[PDB]
């Protein structure tokens, strides 16, 4: 892990630096987008000058035949139309290869991530991951994907996606590998105009363990801040569509009696479910007092508002004026919060919303019953090991340019 790290690209003072201790020099050439909510992740374009070049330390420039090593990062690959990207053409995004094409290379194809390793002689080996088109909800398209590559010179080279091993090939037939002095983050030879997101690039001087890859997958993003649908930080005062992870083919619509329905099947474009369907919500801080940033953290006290128009917002509340155990979620047209709050929490990328009374009493987690979105306390004792456990897990879909559906 941190002991074996020889290159850690992190953000500091309007630039990117190496925090491994070997003092590698990172430079930005052109227009490199920096995410304002998380400046460690950056975007590179191909319609203009946009690249990030890492001049490695002379110590860490790989020039061995037996030393194991690993490479880790996260990549975000948008599929704007799911038609403009339908071109069989391999294009390189990360290039640590010399003039004689010795070294390593991370390239992309249509819904495909390719790893290539070549020695000084020219013997090469390739690993690949094809996640394919979306069949319902895709966990990879326009989302942050954790890529890890381990290399045992006396054994196999393995590729891991989100901590799961997916492709291993022997590299025993490769000799001396002298990688490039530079690590170039740039989109080259791409058939179309696009951008690519990269974050948390790390180089280790050993073959990473599976548990080490899992710890990296779980702790590199901030575990205290909630995540949205794409894997970015969940934001306050930001419009989001809702997605229930147990019924991913359904969306939430508004009823005339202020209740919320779930019997609405998502329309499909080819085999991909439409993401921008249903009601829109906004998260608002209860106790503002200018508490730093707009990031939604665990155990936060928030209000969930429904967006009727661009200017009109109406709080969502749990109707406790019923004999049922589960409380249906209603829209307060008057603006009355009904003396309730919502507590945010998360398991991994999935978010939970606990409706609570102001006196501290629990009303329940946000889930659904039959046709209607409700708040229920049952989810408290059945967070796992039940077919209905995932009914309280929600994803917030932000309408972005990287995912277009018309």
């Amino acid at each position, epitope marked *: 892990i941190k002991s074996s790290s020889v290159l850690n690209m992190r953000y500091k003072n309007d630039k990117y630096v190496d925090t491994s201790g070997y003092d590698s020099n990172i430079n930005i050439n052109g227009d490199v987008y920096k995410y304002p909510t998380n400046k460690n992740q950056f975007g590179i374009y191909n319609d203009k000058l946009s690249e990030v070049n890492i001049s490695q330390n002379d110590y860490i420039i790989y020039d061995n035949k037996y030393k194991n090593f690993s490479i880790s990062f996260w990549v975000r690959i948008p599929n704007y139309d799911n038609k403009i990207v339908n071109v069989n053409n391999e294009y390189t995004i990360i290039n640590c290869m010399r003039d004689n094409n010795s070294g390593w290379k991370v390239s992309l194809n249509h819904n495909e991530i390719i790893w290539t390793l070549q020695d000084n002689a020219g013997i090469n080996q390739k690993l690949a991951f094809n996640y394919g088109n979306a069949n319902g909800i895709s966990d990879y398209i326009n989302k942050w994907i954790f890529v890890t590559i381990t290399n045992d010179r006396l054994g196999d080279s393995k590729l891991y996606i989100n901590g799961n091993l997916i492709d291993q090939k022997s590299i025993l037939n490769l000799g001396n590998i002298h990688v490039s002095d530079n690590i170039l983050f740039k989109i080259v030879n791409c058939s179309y105009t696009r951008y690519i997101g990269i974050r948390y690039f790390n180089i280790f001087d050993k073959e990473l363990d599976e548990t080490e890859i899992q710890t990296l997958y779980s702790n590199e993003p901030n575990t205290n801040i909630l995540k949205d649908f794409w894997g970015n930080y969940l934001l306050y005062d930001k419009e989001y569509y809702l997605l229930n992870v147990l019924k991913p083919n359904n969306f939430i619509d508004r009823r005339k009696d202020s209740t919320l329905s779930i019997n609405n099947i998502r329309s499909t474009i080819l085999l991909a479910n439409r993401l921008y369907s249903g009601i829109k919500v906004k998260i608002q801080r209860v106790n503002n007092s200018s508490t730093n940033d707009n990031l939604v953290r665990k155990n936060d006290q928030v209000y969930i508002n429904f967006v009727a128009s661009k200017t009109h917002l109406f709080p969502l509340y749990a109707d406790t004026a019923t*004999t*049922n155990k589960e409380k249906t979620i209603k829209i307060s047209s008057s603006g009355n919060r009904f003396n309730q709050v919502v507590v945010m929490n998360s398991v991994g990328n999935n978010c939970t919303m606990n409706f609570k009374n102001n006196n501290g009493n629990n009303i329940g987690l946000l*889930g659904f*019953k*039959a*046709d*209607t979105v*409700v708040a229920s306390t049952w989810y408290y004792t059945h967070m796992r090991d039940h077919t*209905n456990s995932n*009914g309280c897990f929600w994803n917030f879909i932000s309408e972005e340019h990287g995912w277009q559906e018309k």
Partner: nanobody
Amino acid sequence: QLVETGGGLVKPGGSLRLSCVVSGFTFDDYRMAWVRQAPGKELEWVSSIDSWSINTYYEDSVKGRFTISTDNAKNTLYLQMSSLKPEDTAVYYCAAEDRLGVPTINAHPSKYDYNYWGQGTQVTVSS
């Protein structure tokens, strides 16, 4: 298309077999239920069955006399009522709940406690 049949007039102590034909979904994705409605009372849940796990649920004032059942094809729901009392004179409705929802059972359910309601069959216990 939820349709119920088998209700009618019986004397105290008689027997009936209510059946409920279902079109559009199987009992593997839905939990089935029988709910009663007295003329001057609100809706009262009678019974419920899961087809994936044969665990059944009954109400206290009705257990022992009623038996809920499901056919091997999972398209027809049955309720065998025996030793009928005059308190059972009500309209009986077939109901279907999404199994993936919150599995709580309300004794006085509203219309949103189940996905689909039937047309209702009348059961009368009179001399």
